[PDB]
C-alpha cells in the first residue's frame, strides 16, 4: 500500500499514504503537490518519513518540479509525521504559530517558518494559494488551503469523507465551533467545486454540506 499520486487539475496532484490504525485496517491520508513554473509546493506530509520522502522524489523525478516549500494544516501525525524527511530533503516548511506549539506538545517536529493567522477568518496568500484559518474544528489549529486557478479547496481533516457520519479522531476537536468553521471555509471559497478531505475521496461541495450537518450542535 505505497504512496499514490492522482491528478486533480492542471498542475495540482493529490498524494495519498496509508497507515494501519488498529483495529480498523489501513487509513488513507491525503495532501497536495501544486506546481509552479520550475518548482512545486506541498500541502501536508504523509504519515511518516518514508512516505513523505517518496512524495519529494516523485515531484523531482516525475514532475521535474522539485518541492521547495510546504504548508501543514494542523499538528497531527497524518499532516506532520514526515517533517524530518522534508527538513532533510531541503523543503522549507511553514505552519501557524499555534500548530507549531501543538506539534511540539504532541511529539511532532515543528515547521521552520511561522504563519500568523490566529484570528478566525484570517487569510493570507502563500505561494499563490489562499490559506484561511476558519476557526477550530477537527483540531483547534486546523487551516484550509484554496488553489484558485483550478478552484480546488483542500479541506484537510476539517472536512469528513463522503456521506459518513463518523467524526474520526476527535481527541483535539472543537465540537462547538466545527460546523461554523466549515461554513466559514465554504463562504470564503465559493468557486471551488472540488473539495479534498484528508481521509476520503476527492468530492464536491456536498462534502462541505455533509460535514457541517454531521458536526452541527
Residue ranges binding its own copies (CB under 8 A): 68-69, 84, 87-90, 92, 107, 109, 112-114, 116
In order, the DSSP letters of 145-192 are EEETTTTEEEEETTS--TT-------TT--TTTHHHHHHHHHHH-TT-
Restricting to residues 102-161, name those near Zn ion by CB under 5 A.
157
- Three-state DSSP at 104 gives helix
109 binds, among Zn ion, its own copies, none (CB under 5 to 8 A by kind): its own copies
Q: Alpha-carbon distance 36 to 21, whole Å? A: 35
26 labelled as ligand-binding?
A: no
Residue 72 found at the interface with Zn ion (CB under 5 A) = no
101 binds, among its own copies, Zn ion, none (CB under 5 to 8 A by kind): none
What b/e readout covers 114-126, taking b as 16+ CB neighbours within 10 angstroms? ebebeeeeebeeb
Restricting to residues 21-60, name those near Zn ion by CB under 5 A.
none
CA distance to 18, 88, 117, 125, per residue, from 199 (Å): 10, 27, 25, 25
117 binds, among Zn ion, its own copies, none (CB under 5 to 8 A by kind): none
Nearer to Zn ion, 69 or 108 (CB): 108
Nearer to its own copies, 107 or 217 (CB): 107
180 binds, among its own copies, Zn ion, none (CB under 5 to 8 A by kind): none
Nearer to its own copies, 109 or 173 (CB): 109
Q: How far is the CB of 86 from its own copies (least distance, A)?
A: 10
Contact (CB, 8 A) for 89 and 49: no
198 binds, among Zn ion, its own copies, none (CB under 5 to 8 A by kind): Zn ion
CA of residue 176 relative to chain centroid, distance: 22
Residue 43: closest CA among 133, 162, 147: 147
Q: Alpha-carbon distance 151 to 186, whole Å? A: 12
Q: Point out which span in 30-38, 71-79, 179-187, 201-209 binds Zn ion (CB under 5 A).
A: 71-79
In the set 49, 54, 78, 147, which binds Zn ion (CB under 5 A)? Answer: 78
15 labelled as ligand-binding?
A: no
Q: How far is the CB of 134 from Zn ion (least distance, A)?
A: 15
Cell of 202: 476527492
Q: Point out the annotated binding site.
A: 74, 76, 78, 138, 157, 160, 169, 199
Amino acid at each position: 500500500k505505497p504512496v499514490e499520486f492522482v491528478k486533480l487539475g492542471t498542475g495540482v496532484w493529490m498524494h495519498t499514504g496509508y497507515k494501519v490504525v488498529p483495529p480498523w485496517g489501513n487509513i488513507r491520508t491525503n495532501g497536495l503537490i501544486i506546481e509552479r513554473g520550475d518548482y512545486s509546493v506541498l500541502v501536508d506530509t504523509a504519515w511518516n518519513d518514508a512516505q513523505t520522502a517518496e512524495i519529494v522524489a516523485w515531484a523531482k523525478d516525475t514532475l521535474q518540479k522539485p518541492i521547495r516549500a510546504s504548508i501543514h494544516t494542523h499538528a497531527h501525525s497524518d499532516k506532520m509525521g514526515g517533517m524530518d524527511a522534508l527538513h532533510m530533503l531541503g523543503v522549507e516548511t511553514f505552519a501557524t504559530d499555534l500548530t507549531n506549539r501543538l506539534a511540539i506538545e504532541r511529539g511532532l517536529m515543528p515547521a521552520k517558518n511561522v504563519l500568523n493567522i490566529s484570528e478566525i477568518g484570517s487569510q493570507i496568500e502563500w505561494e499563490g494559494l489562499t490559506i484561511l484559518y476558519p476557526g477550530g474544528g477537527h483540531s483547534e489549529d486546523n487551516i484550509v488551503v484554496n488553489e484558485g486557478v483550478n478552484n480546488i479547496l483542500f479541506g484537510g481533516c476539517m472536512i469528513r469523507p463522503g456521506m459518513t457520519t463518523s467524526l474520526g479522531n476527535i481527541d483535539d476537536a472543537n465540537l462547538g465551533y466545527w460546523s461554523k468553521a466549515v461554513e466559514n471555509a465554504a463562504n470564503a471559497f465559493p468557486d471551488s467545486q472540488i473539495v479534498i478531505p484528508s481521509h476520503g475521496k476527492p468530492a464536491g461541495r456536498e462534502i462541505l454540506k455533509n460535514t457541517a450537518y454531521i458536526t452541527r450542535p
